[PDB]
Amino acid sequence: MNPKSLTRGPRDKPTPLEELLPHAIEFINQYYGSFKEAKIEEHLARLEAVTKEIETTGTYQLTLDELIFATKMAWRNAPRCIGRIQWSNLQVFDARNCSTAQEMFQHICRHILYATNNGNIRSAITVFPQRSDGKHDFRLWNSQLIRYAGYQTIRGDAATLEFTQLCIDLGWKPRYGRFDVLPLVLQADGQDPEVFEIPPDLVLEVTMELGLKWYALPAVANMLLEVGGLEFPACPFNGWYMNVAVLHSFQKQNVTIMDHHTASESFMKHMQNEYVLSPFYYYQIEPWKTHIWQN
Amino acid sequence: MNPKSLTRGPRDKPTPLEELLPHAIEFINQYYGSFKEAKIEEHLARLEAVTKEIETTGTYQLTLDELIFATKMAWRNAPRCIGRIQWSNLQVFDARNCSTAQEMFQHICRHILYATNNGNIRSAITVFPQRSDGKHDFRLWNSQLIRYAGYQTIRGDAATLEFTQLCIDLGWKPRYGRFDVLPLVLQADGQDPEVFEIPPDLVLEVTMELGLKWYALPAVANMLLEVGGLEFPACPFNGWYMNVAVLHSFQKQNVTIMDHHTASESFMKHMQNEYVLSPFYYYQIEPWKTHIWQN
Ligand code: HEM
Ligand code: HEM
Ligand SMILES: COC(=O)N1CCN(c2ccnc(-n3ccnc3)n2)[C@@H](CC(=O)NCc2ccc3c(c2)OCO3)C1
Ligand SMILES: COC(=O)N1CCN(c2ccnc(-n3ccnc3)n2)[C@@H](CC(=O)NCc2ccc3c(c2)OCO3)C1
Ligand SMILES: O=S([O-])[O-]
Ligand SMILES: O=S([O-])[O-]
């Protein structure tokens, strides 16, 4: 075998124009090829502008349209994603102009709100600024936008035990329940991560005595979007969930799950929208294992 | 004399609870003893939970913290290791949940990347699932993560002549250069080994006409970690290298070697982290000499 790595690590310097160019060209190719025999003059022109730009600025900016196309194509290329069948149903939030962790927070707040949509889950992705030299990376240290802390008898999510310790170390006041929603650990422009509490009303939970519940919104926070040689280390996305007591409560409280109805319904919308792998979503090495602290 | 064996062979059945228990207890002892006079109540509790667990499941799971402690203590106990002076500088990757060779491959890919770190070598260990009955062993058939094949006039590394033949027998397409990087021969859950080509960009080489070069990352792939009666047959680790043309090129290309600066620097970090032997790393009998082929 010769499988490729699903992880795309850090860089301490920009991509060689000699590496970036062939990649940029192939993306513009597949992007414009999507207009089958249409816009050949548009294609050629884009090729020149992009090339000139990489040659002068050392990099290039995708159009919003190329971005939206990349996010959807990268979703289609997600091997294990079951929801990719309806890849056209995706809302893209352009935060490529984001510059601070406070701004990141606000963008993430906007995504959670739109996406949650009172239980009627909508798929969305918020794309932050692309990696430049690798020394000014935007990153969400969390693995998911919404997740429960695991403390001590483990009091919480045993799966988040490491990250929870990290938050406490960053200053986060650890309560000790088993359903504590972890704050967002946001890194902007390569700085040290800032901790921000997620407004509690933004978090929709399905109430499964046991006193059990769970969050409604499944959002991956730590992947990297690669497109045309460009890399976006911060691009949180979400879908809706795919043991029967749960299946019943999600439905009872009207929070979207991938049941037969939703399967039929979303595919229908997807279909009614009809009228190495790249782009691709890569895993990353956990940021606390690679971060060089300023403070 | 009465030296002990440095090899820890295979088992075809689980460890007797009567053998495992005294061992588990002594590890929890030294682990908790590390908090000198602190957490005696924590210690006692752990003892009960572990005992109960061995008695019910027939075995026990270390905490991530106990694992990290074991990996570092086993490094400290490595007699011939010169880098153990700075044993606190170790990154642990928990793959105890790994279940397939494809997953193993991905984990190994993640380690190589982190560890290599563009030449600025970082020490890491990736720990795979512990031996259960001995019939579902995870193993890396390679002796090192990165090594050159030796063919024929020997065309390569004479030291890897046997393993190279093995790879070819497993299906590997042998090129015939003297710097062919061998694929990874991964055994998951006791099955037959699967061959995976290491993504070439993951391999950093120091370019020593002669056309000589060498890989930057020295990683031991075939040792066994014993801790508290538990055994981990798959736990690849690495450090950085410790004839003058070489010393100069490693430095010139900024690939970490254990020179006076690195010696001062790493010890400093190690020190600034201050603010029979068990655990222990055992050698193993070469897996092709003991493997029972399914296919
Ligand atoms: C709309 C509902 C969706 C459903 C029901 C769905 C379902 C799934 C499932 C079942 C998994 C595997 C879970 C696991 O490994 O435990 C998954 C993984 C994943 N999904 Fe989705 N998903 C949805 C939306 C999205 C969106 C909007 C994107 C991106 C824009 C996306 C990208 C991916 C990625 C990148 C992974 C990992 C793929 C891999 O590693 O092979 N998903 N999804
Ligand atoms: C950080 C840099 C490190 C340096 C420079 C270093 C240096 C060495 C040297 C010089 C040897 C002997 C080589 C030989 O026999 O030819 C060695 C062996 C060994 N090292 Fe390291 N090492 C490092 C990191 C590590 C790490 C991270 C671990 C494990 C977590 C480790 C575990 C061992 C083991 C188990 C052996 C064999 C010991 C024995 O059989 O007595 N080393 N190392
Ligand atoms: C090695 O790790 C991984 O490959 N992953 C990717 C899958 N995971 C998650 C977590 C939350 N949301 C999503 N997610 C959302 C849309 N697409 C995927 N994936 C994480 C694992 C996880 O918690 N999965 C539960 C799960 C199952 C089905 C889902 C889901 C989450 O979200 C949508 O459908 C980590
Ligand atoms: C009987 O065999 C053994 O005891 N061993 C253990 C030492 N060896 C190796 C090989 C690669 N990396 C390491 N290694 C890495 C970190 N610590 C040790 N050891 C192998 C032998 C070897 O190739 N040694 C070269 C060497 C020398 C100094 C090193 C080194 C490798 O790695 C770090 O410092 C096999
Ligand atoms: O948007 S599509 O290709 O059904
Ligand atoms: O981590 S220590 O004991 O210097």
UniProtKB/Swiss-Prot annotation, chains A, B:
Induction description = By treatment with endotoxins or cytokines. Induced by lipopolysaccharides (LPS) in macrophages (in vitro). Expression in the liver oscillates in a circadian manner with peak levels occurring during the late night.
The record's account of how the chain is modified after translation: Polyubiquitinated; mediated by SPSB1, SPSB2 and SPSB4, leading to proteasomal degradation.
State the tissue distribution.
Answer: Macrophages.
- Subcellular location(s) per record: Cytoplasm, Cytosol
Q: How does it assemble?
A: Homodimer. Interacts with NHERF1. Interacts with GAPDH. Interacts with S100A8 and S100A9 to form the iNOS-S100A8/9 transnitrosylase complex. Interacts with SPSB1, SPSB2 and SPSB4. Interacts with ELOC and CUL5 in the presence of SPSB1 or SPSB2 or SPSB4. Forms a complex with ASL, ASS1 and HSP90AA1; the complex regulates cell-autonomous L-arginine synthesis and citrulline recycling while channeling extracellular L-arginine to nitric oxide synthesis pathway.
The free-text function statement in the UniProt record for this protein reads: Produces nitric oxide (NO) which is a messenger molecule with diverse functions throughout the body. In macrophages, NO mediates tumoricidal and bactericidal actions. Also has nitrosylase activity and mediates cysteine S-nitrosylation of cytoplasmic target proteins such PTGS2/COX2. As component of the iNOS-S100A8/9 transnitrosylase complex involved in the selective inflammatory stimulus-dependent S-nitrosylation of GAPDH implicated in regulation of the GAIT complex activity and probably multiple targets including ANXA5, EZR, MSN and VIM.
Indicate the family of this protein.
Belongs to the NOS family.
Record's protein name: Nitric oxide synthase, inducible
Identify the coding gene: Nos2
Q: Which residues of the full protein are shown?
A: 114 to 497 of 1144
